[PDB]
Design an enzyme around this catalytic site. Structure first.
Site, mmCIF file in Angstrom:
data_model
loop_
_atom_site.group_PDB
_atom_site.id
_atom_site.type_symbol
_atom_site.label_atom_id
_atom_site.label_comp_id
_atom_site.label_asym_id
_atom_site.label_seq_id
_atom_site.Cartn_x
_atom_site.Cartn_y
_atom_site.Cartn_z
ATOM 1 N N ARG A 182 -1.639 47.288 -49.780
ATOM 2 C CA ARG A 182 -0.695 46.096 -49.800
ATOM 3 C C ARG A 182 -1.038 45.408 -48.532
ATOM 4 N NH1 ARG A 182 3.666 46.745 -48.464
ATOM 5 N NH2 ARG A 182 3.967 49.071 -48.470
ATOM 6 N N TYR B 131 -5.781 46.938 -55.924
ATOM 7 C CA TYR B 131 -5.331 48.208 -55.330
ATOM 8 C C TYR B 131 -3.875 48.491 -55.571
ATOM 9 C CZ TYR B 131 -5.306 52.347 -52.389
ATOM 10 O OH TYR B 131 -5.012 53.562 -51.860
ATOM 11 N N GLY C 292 -0.285 48.717 -54.882
ATOM 12 C CA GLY C 292 0.935 47.760 -55.149
ATOM 13 C C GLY C 292 0.590 46.502 -55.297
ATOM 14 N N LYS D 277 5.903 47.855 -57.222
ATOM 15 C CA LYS D 277 6.677 47.229 -56.029
ATOM 16 C C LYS D 277 7.063 45.814 -56.457
ATOM 17 C CE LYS D 277 6.414 50.834 -53.129
ATOM 18 N NZ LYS D 277 7.455 51.463 -52.572
ATOM 19 N N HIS E 157 14.558 51.232 -52.630
ATOM 20 C CA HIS E 157 13.652 52.127 -52.220
ATOM 21 C C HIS E 157 14.007 53.422 -51.985
ATOM 22 C CE1 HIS E 157 9.476 52.291 -49.498
ATOM 23 N NE2 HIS E 157 9.641 52.892 -50.984
ATOM 24 N N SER F 3 7.818 54.341 -44.310
ATOM 25 C CA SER F 3 6.655 55.189 -44.493
ATOM 26 C C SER F 3 6.637 56.318 -43.663
ATOM 27 C CB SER F 3 5.596 54.079 -44.439
ATOM 28 O OG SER F 3 5.447 53.583 -43.163
ATOM 29 N N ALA F 4 6.108 57.459 -44.013
ATOM 30 C CA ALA F 4 5.730 58.700 -43.094
ATOM 31 C C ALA F 4 6.600 59.338 -42.618
ATOM 32 C CB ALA F 4 4.554 58.465 -42.402
ATOM 33 N N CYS F 5 7.938 59.332 -43.518
ATOM 34 C CA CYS F 5 9.066 60.111 -43.211
ATOM 35 C C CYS F 5 9.265 61.346 -43.867
ATOM 36 C CB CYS F 5 10.075 59.025 -43.140
ATOM 37 S SG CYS F 5 10.268 57.990 -41.686
ATOM 38 N N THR G 199 8.475 61.714 -50.243
ATOM 39 C CA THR G 199 8.047 62.590 -51.298
ATOM 40 C C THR G 199 8.326 64.327 -51.124
ATOM 41 O OG1 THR G 199 6.514 61.159 -51.858
ATOM 42 C CG2 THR G 199 6.322 63.086 -53.169
ATOM 43 N N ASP H 235 10.519 57.476 -55.394
ATOM 44 C CA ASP H 235 10.036 55.955 -54.805
ATOM 45 C C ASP H 235 11.080 55.070 -54.868
ATOM 46 O OD1 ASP H 235 8.401 54.659 -53.303
ATOM 47 O OD2 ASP H 235 7.509 53.553 -54.758
ATOM 48 N N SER I 241 -5.046 56.521 -48.754
ATOM 49 C CA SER I 241 -5.507 57.030 -50.355
ATOM 50 C C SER I 241 -4.212 57.636 -51.171
ATOM 51 C CB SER I 241 -6.651 58.102 -49.808
ATOM 52 O OG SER I 241 -6.138 59.168 -49.122
ATOM 53 N N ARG I 242 -4.612 57.616 -52.435
ATOM 54 C CA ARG I 242 -3.608 57.887 -53.263
ATOM 55 C C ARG I 242 -3.790 58.924 -54.162
ATOM 56 N NH1 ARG I 242 1.612 54.952 -52.159
ATOM 57 N NH2 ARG I 242 0.757 53.616 -50.379
ATOM 58 N N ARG J 198 11.742 58.205 -38.426
ATOM 59 C CA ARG J 198 11.120 58.892 -37.309
ATOM 60 C C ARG J 198 11.614 58.302 -36.031
ATOM 61 N NH1 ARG J 198 7.065 59.648 -39.289
ATOM 62 N NH2 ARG J 198 6.112 61.656 -39.113
ATOM 63 N N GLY K 202 11.105 72.831 -46.024
ATOM 64 C CA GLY K 202 12.173 73.727 -46.536
ATOM 65 C C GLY K 202 13.556 73.855 -45.884
ATOM 66 N N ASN L 239 15.110 71.796 -44.207
ATOM 67 C CA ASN L 239 15.752 70.511 -44.608
ATOM 68 C C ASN L 239 17.182 70.814 -45.729
ATOM 69 O OD1 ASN L 239 14.576 69.347 -42.599
ATOM 70 N ND2 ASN L 239 13.363 67.944 -44.036
HETATM 71 MN MN LIG Z 1 7.334 53.569 -51.464
#
Ligand SMILES: [Mn+2]
Ligand SMILES: [Mn+2]
Ligand code: NA
Length: 613
Positions: free
Chosen positions: A85, A233, A235, A242, A262, A284-286, A289, A309, A402-403, A434, A522, A524
């Site tokens: 994006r 690509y 999004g 999105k 979100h 992102s990156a927290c 998933t 998501d 990458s996805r 974070r 785990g 968490n």
């Molecule tokens: Mn998302």
């Protein structure tokens, strides 16, 4: 009608019929065919046959490769110019700028990008006429949410990308049944082109059609239109992902009295046979998933995934906040995914999955940074750039963005209610970020109003910069963030509303050596246990200036030890004085005249509580 032969595109239809389409759908398809000049029109049926043959076709044109190690898995490698994006080319069109973003007090808005109706018409005209020449226009009828759900919304996406068709089949519910269900109802008009009419005017890189220079992802909420050009690509091209799910939907939600967020949705069951659903918004990156598919370490606890998501949520007549996952699959960031971090994701993606910009092992498997599993001697790696790659090279084997694109039905812990039309009742909402310093592992908001403030105040290490990402929605607001805050706050005055408890988490607090204070993964589940009890009314909290934290001995640390709970939950006056100043400066500038009274009040209240320590 016509005086010649250029308006009726019936003779160019290679699947389906324009005659069989609902009137407004034909007008949408045919009008855009007139504009874009495709060679053919393919009305998607969503069948396994259609999907299988399209994949085989892409494989022949060098657009995708079959991954022979797995069951029906595929790999696409993109033009390196088209990998994510692009915020600066993502815009929302409204008559007034103020309806789209608040007018900031001093700076540039980072809460969205407004484009005038006039600037967009010019941009549109410079891009779309003739753009699909020599290509097939695919018509994708899709449902966001379980088919026929009162919370579901329907879209029709036109695209000249087979990659988009295949991915949309995974990420949404698409095909003939959607058209039949739609009838003469309203739908979101989604138009996409890679912007490479044939004959090609520019070199094709890596068999990936794109137009970086003219890339523009536009949203027109008043026209119920999404118009995207130049990127194939994620999004930018999968218009449900999105553009529809968050940007258009949040504006629809504002209009209609619901919420488009979100957030992951998970179902958690305790050892007493009680189940609760929670939603969580993380930047992102927290580990979003990772939380959604968590494998709990505590005995007798179970976590199940509704979505990873997007959440669409609406208070029903009974006051329950009912939520659906409007998606049909997971479009997950591949790097960092391992058997340790996400064993359930590993199980999901080994079948019927499309991979983009990951590395390929010589035996037809997948590889990325953080995969955390060795390759047998002999097995070599081709990077995402189609070059030979070794674990001691300078550059990563997979693009950081990458996805994997995988059917949600394949998650081994998918919730049994994950496609229930009524949605699932949300009892807790979790915000996160974070934060290497200052922010405790978990706290609970003092009220709904405080909770909305907590969402608004969200920050996260981008690391050596702490950036703002309110509600994890910063790149995704469909309209004025100030008005979004008002909308959230108004939920408290809705008759019978059962307002979920609001929490904030930080898995990423470090000591003075830079080592994580919390084992995470785990473990968490211990934090989730505390939340579960709090929702039940457990007297397991202690008041602090920032909200409630677990009492001494409240947090289940059995099997752990020795965990530095003192440091983990430490609240420093000096840190929080600075923190509240940064929040103040941010809200004043970015929200300005549209900052609701109650958010300002919460800021004042937090300031006061900190001042008294
Ligand atoms: Mn998302
Ligand atoms: Mn109020
Ligand atoms: Na390629």
């Amino acid at each position: 009608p016509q005086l010649h032969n250029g308006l009726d595109f019936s003779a160019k239809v290679i699947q389906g019929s324009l005659d069989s389409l609902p009137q407004e759908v034909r007008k949408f398809v045919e009008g855009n065919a007139q504009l874009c000049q495709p060679e053919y029109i393919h009305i998607c049926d969503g069948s396994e046959e259609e999907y299988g043959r399209l994949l085989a076709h892409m494989q022949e044109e060098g657009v995708i490769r079959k991954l022979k190690k797995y069951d029906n898995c595929w790999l696409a490698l993109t033009d390196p110019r088209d990998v994510a994006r692009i915020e600066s080319k993502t815009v929302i069109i409204t008559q007034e700028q103020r309806d789209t973003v608040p007018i900031p007090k001093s700076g540039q808005s980072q809460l969205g990008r407004w484009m005038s109706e006039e600037d967009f018409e010019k941009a549109f005209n410079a891009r779309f006429p003739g753009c699909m020449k020599g290509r097939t226009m695919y018509v994708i009828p899709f449902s966001m949410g379980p088919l026929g759900s009162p919370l579901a919304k329907i879209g029709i996406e036109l695209t000249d990308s087979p990659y988009v068709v295949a991915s949309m089949r995974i990420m949404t519910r698409m095909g003939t049944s959607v058209l039949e269900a739609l009838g003469d109802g309203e739908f979101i008009k989604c138009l996409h082109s890679v912007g490479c009419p044939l004959p090609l005017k520019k070199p094709l890189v890596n068999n990936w059609a794109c137009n970086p220079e003219l890339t523009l992802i536009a949203h027109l909420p008043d026209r119920r239109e999404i118009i995207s050009f130049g990127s194939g690509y994620g999004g930018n091209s999968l218009l449900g992902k999105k553009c529809f799910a968050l940007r258009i939907a949040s504006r629809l939600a504002k209009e209609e009295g619901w919420l488009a967020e979100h957030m992951l949705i998970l179902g958690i069951t305790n050892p007493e046979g009680k189940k609760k659903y929670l939603a969580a918004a993380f930047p992102s990156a927290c580990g979003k998933t990772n939380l959604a598919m968590m494998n709990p370490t505590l005995p007798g606890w179970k976590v199940e995934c509704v979505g990873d998501d997007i959440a669409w949520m609406k208070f029903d007549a009974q006051g329950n906040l009912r939520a659906i996952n409007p998606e049909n699959g997971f479009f997950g960031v591949a790097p960092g995914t391992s058997v340790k971090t996400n064993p359930n994701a590993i199980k999901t993606i080994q079948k019927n999955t499309i991979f983009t910009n990951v590395a390929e092992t010589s035996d037809g498997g997948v590889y990325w940074e953080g995969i955390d599993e060795p390759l047998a001697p002999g097995v070599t790696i081709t990077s995402w750039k189609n070059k030979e790659w070794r674990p001691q090279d300078e550059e990563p084997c997979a693009h950081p963005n990458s996805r994997f694109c995988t059917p949600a039905s394949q998650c081994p812990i998918i919730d049994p209610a994950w496609e229930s039309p009524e949605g699932v009742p949300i009892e807790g909402i979790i915000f996160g970020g974070r934060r290497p310093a200052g922010v405790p592992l978990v706290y609970e908001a003092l009220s709904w109003q405080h909770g909305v403030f907590v969402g608004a105040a969200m920050r996260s290490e981008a690391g050596k910069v702490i950036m703002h990402d309110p509600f994890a929605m910063r790149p995704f607001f469909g309209y004025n963030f100030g008005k979004y805050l008002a909308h959230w706050l108004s939920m408290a005055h809705r008759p019978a509303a059962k307002l979920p408890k609001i929490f904030h988490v930080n898995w990423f607090r470090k000591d003075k050596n830079g080592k994580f204070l919390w084992p995470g993964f785990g473990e968490n589940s211990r934090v989730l246990e505390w939340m579960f009890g709090r929702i039940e009314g457990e007297d397991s909290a202690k008041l602090t200036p920032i909200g409630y934290v677990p009492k001494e001995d409240a947090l289940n640390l059995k099997g752990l030890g020795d965990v530095n709970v003192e440091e983990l939950f430490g609240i420093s006056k000096e840190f929080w004085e600075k923190e509240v100043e940064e929040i103040d400066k941010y809200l004043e500038d970015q929200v300005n005249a549209d900052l609701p009274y109650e958010i300002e009040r919460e800021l004042r209240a937090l300031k006061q509580r900190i001042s008294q320590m």
